[PDB]
Structure formats: structure tokens, C-alpha cells
Write an enzyme that holds these catalytic residues in place. Sequence first.
Site, PDB file in Angstrom:
ATOM      1  N   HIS A   1     -24.043  17.117 -45.021  1.00 52.74           N
ATOM      2  CA  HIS A   1     -25.216  17.860 -44.625  1.00 52.74           C
ATOM      3  C   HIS A   1     -26.428  17.487 -45.479  1.00 52.74           C
ATOM      4  CE1 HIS A   1     -22.291  20.357 -42.431  1.00 52.74           C
ATOM      5  NE2 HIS A   1     -23.334  20.692 -41.690  1.00 52.74           N
TER       6      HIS A   1
ATOM      7  N   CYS B   1     -30.019  19.032 -39.524  1.00 53.41           N
ATOM      8  CA  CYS B   1     -30.282  19.297 -40.937  1.00 53.41           C
ATOM      9  C   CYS B   1     -30.982  18.106 -41.601  1.00 53.41           C
ATOM     10  CB  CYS B   1     -28.996  19.668 -41.696  1.00 53.41           C
ATOM     11  SG  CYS B   1     -27.639  18.495 -41.523  1.00 53.41           S
TER      12      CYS B   1
ATOM     13  N   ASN C   1     -32.237  25.173 -47.409  1.00 55.84           N
ATOM     14  CA  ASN C   1     -31.444  24.801 -46.236  1.00 55.84           C
ATOM     15  C   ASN C   1     -32.278  25.033 -44.992  1.00 55.84           C
ATOM     16  OD1 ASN C   1     -29.152  23.883 -44.780  1.00 55.84           O
ATOM     17  ND2 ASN C   1     -27.786  25.055 -46.077  1.00 55.84           N
TER      18      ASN C   1
ATOM     19  N   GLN D   1     -32.144  25.679 -37.680  1.00 63.00           N
ATOM     20  CA  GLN D   1     -31.818  24.492 -36.869  1.00 63.00           C
ATOM     21  C   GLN D   1     -31.029  24.832 -35.592  1.00 63.00           C
ATOM     22  OE1 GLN D   1     -29.376  22.752 -40.233  1.00 63.00           O
ATOM     23  NE2 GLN D   1     -28.046  22.104 -38.550  1.00 63.00           N
TER      24      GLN D   1
HETATM   25  C1  LIG Z   1     -26.536  18.505 -40.171  1.00 64.04           C
HETATM   26  N1  LIG Z   1     -26.891  19.623 -39.645  1.00 64.04           N
HETATM   27  C2  LIG Z   1     -25.471  17.587 -39.636  1.00 64.04           C
HETATM   28  N2  LIG Z   1     -25.137  16.571 -40.658  1.00 64.04           N
HETATM   29  C3  LIG Z   1     -25.787  15.363 -40.762  1.00 64.04           C
HETATM   30  O1  LIG Z   1     -26.691  15.097 -39.968  1.00 64.04           O
HETATM   31  C4  LIG Z   1     -25.306  14.416 -41.829  1.00 64.04           C
HETATM   32  C5  LIG Z   1     -26.273  14.192 -42.997  1.00 64.04           C
HETATM   33  C6  LIG Z   1     -25.931  12.783 -43.497  1.00 64.04           C
HETATM   34  S1  LIG Z   1     -25.316  12.901 -45.156  1.00 64.04           S
HETATM   35  O2  LIG Z   1     -26.461  13.380 -45.944  1.00 64.04           O
HETATM   36  O3  LIG Z   1     -24.205  13.856 -45.118  1.00 64.04           O
HETATM   37  C7  LIG Z   1     -24.716  11.255 -45.575  1.00 64.04           C
HETATM   38  C8  LIG Z   1     -23.367  10.896 -45.333  1.00 64.04           C
HETATM   39  C9  LIG Z   1     -22.862   9.621 -45.672  1.00 64.04           C
HETATM   40  C10 LIG Z   1     -23.714   8.673 -46.260  1.00 64.04           C
HETATM   41  C11 LIG Z   1     -25.053   9.015 -46.513  1.00 64.04           C
HETATM   42  C12 LIG Z   1     -25.549  10.290 -46.172  1.00 64.04           C
HETATM   43  C13 LIG Z   1     -24.871  12.162 -42.570  1.00 64.04           C
HETATM   44  C14 LIG Z   1     -25.015  12.998 -41.295  1.00 64.04           C
HETATM   45  C15 LIG Z   1     -23.858  12.872 -40.318  1.00 64.04           C
HETATM   46  O4  LIG Z   1     -23.039  13.780 -40.189  1.00 64.04           O
HETATM   47  N3  LIG Z   1     -23.717  11.718 -39.534  1.00 64.04           N
HETATM   48  C16 LIG Z   1     -22.418  11.389 -38.893  1.00 64.04           C
HETATM   49  C17 LIG Z   1     -22.691  10.899 -37.463  1.00 64.04           C
HETATM   50  O5  LIG Z   1     -23.654   9.838 -37.484  1.00 64.04           O
HETATM   51  C18 LIG Z   1     -24.927  10.197 -38.040  1.00 64.04           C
HETATM   52  C19 LIG Z   1     -24.745  10.655 -39.492  1.00 64.04           C
END
Ligand SMILES: *C(=N)CNC(=O)[C@@H]1C[C@@H](S(=O)(=O)c2ccccc2)C[C@H]1C(=O)N1CCOCC1
Length: 219
Positions: free
Chosen positions: A166, A26, A186, A20
Site C-alpha cells: 500500500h 492509494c 492514509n 479512496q
Molecule cells: C492501494 N490502495 C492498492 N495498493 C497498491 O496500489 C500498491 C502500492 C505499490 S507498493 O507501494 O506496495 C510497491 C510494491 C512493490 C514494489 C514497489 C512498490 C504496489 C501496488 C500494487 O499492489 N500493485 C500490484 C498490481 O500491479 C500494480 C502494483
Amino acid sequence: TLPDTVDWREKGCVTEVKYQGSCGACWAFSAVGALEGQLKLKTGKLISLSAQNLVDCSNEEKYGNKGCGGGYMTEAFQYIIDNGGIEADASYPYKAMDEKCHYNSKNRAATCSRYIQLPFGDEDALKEAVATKGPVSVGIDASHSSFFFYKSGVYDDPSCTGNVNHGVLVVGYGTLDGKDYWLVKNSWGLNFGDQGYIRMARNNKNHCGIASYCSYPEI
Ligand SMILES: *C(=N)CNC(=O)[C@@H]1C[C@@H](S(=O)(=O)c2ccccc2)C[C@H]1C(=O)N1CCOCC1
């Protein structure tokens, strides 16, 4: 009975491990991985789907996804439903940057009609989906340095929390040297983990919140 061991890689339902880069995508890789598994189960053909399409085209308050700023796998699925399709990685390659949406319906490679979420914290429900449906998109707490020191065996860091950050793909499960695990793909390249994979503790009280935000799409 469910099988004691599942590995969707062995059924040709998992594409190559992706990288990525510096873009927080992710969630888009998790989402396409889940759909890729379904596409193979429906059509018999295994094809990498476009994480970039998700990053570029779902970056709006409508979805609450933020491109390289992060996003949600289920909202990726919703985008695909709303949009009537997604391109393959071949026609819409990964740039690791937020760009203008250039989806084109003539390169549609997969569709999504609906998606399914599993109950929060239910490892038994995640096992069933993984055994009977296919690879499942999940959120984990991958915020600890030990996640990236991991090389083999089963990751069970006691510093892990239920606060997920993530998106990853569960492509199987089993038991390694007496320890139950989830087999996780991953999107940090082959040099992450064990050729891009990590075994994470299973049945240890929703460790790293792996069962907290589980979903999969239906073609
Ligand atoms: C990945 N490389 C960066 N992380 C994300 O994109 C995360 C993934 C999702 S989660 O699966 O962690 C999640 C968290 C809370 C409730 C349901 C699922 C969230 C996402 C993330 O960091 N964000 C924060 C900023 O806004 C978009 C979502």
C-alpha cells in the site's frame, strides 16, 4: 542537526485526508500528496491534486499502473513528467472508478520535472528527506487487521513484514512517549486511524517496510 520533530501539516503543506473507497488508488493519493507538498513549497498555495487523473491516464503497460487495480507512485510521477502536467481535484474529481482519460492542459495545476527515490530500507535517508524536502511517498505493509484496529499511540505490530502493498504519505516524524514514529497520511477518510493518520514505528529495522520504496517529486 535535523529537527527532532517534523510535521508538514503545521507548515500548511498537507491537504485534507481523502477517501479512496473500493478503488485501489492509494498509490495515486500517495503520489498527489507528495506533489501537493512541493506545490505549496514552491508557489505558497495548497491545492488538492487529481488522483483520478493518475488513475484514468496512467493505466497502461507503459507505466505498469492498473488504475483501481493498483500502481506505483514513481510511475505516477513519470506519467506527470511525460504528460506535462496534472489537474487539480477541482477540475478532475475523484470517482473511485477506472474511466477514460480526460486530462486537459488548460486545467494544468502542477507539473513534475523529475523525481527522487531514496535508498531501500534507509530510515536515516527517509528522515533527512522528510525534514529537508517535504512529504515523501512510501510503500508499507498494511495487510494486517491490526493496521485498521489502530487508534492512537505508535503502530508496531510484530506480524508486519517488509513486503509492501500500500502507498501512503509520510508527512512527518518524531517520538511519542519514548517511541520513534513516522507520521503517515492514509487515504481511507478521517475515520481511519487518528483522523486519517497513523504513527508507525521508526528506527525498528524498517518496520512494515516503510523505508523500502520511498520517493518524492520535484516541481
Ligand atoms: C492501494 N490502495 C492498492 N495498493 C497498491 O496500489 C500498491 C502500492 C505499490 S507498493 O507501494 O506496495 C510497491 C510494491 C512493490 C514494489 C514497489 C512498490 C504496489 C501496488 C500494487 O499492489 N500493485 C500490484 C498490481 O500491479 C500494480 C502494483
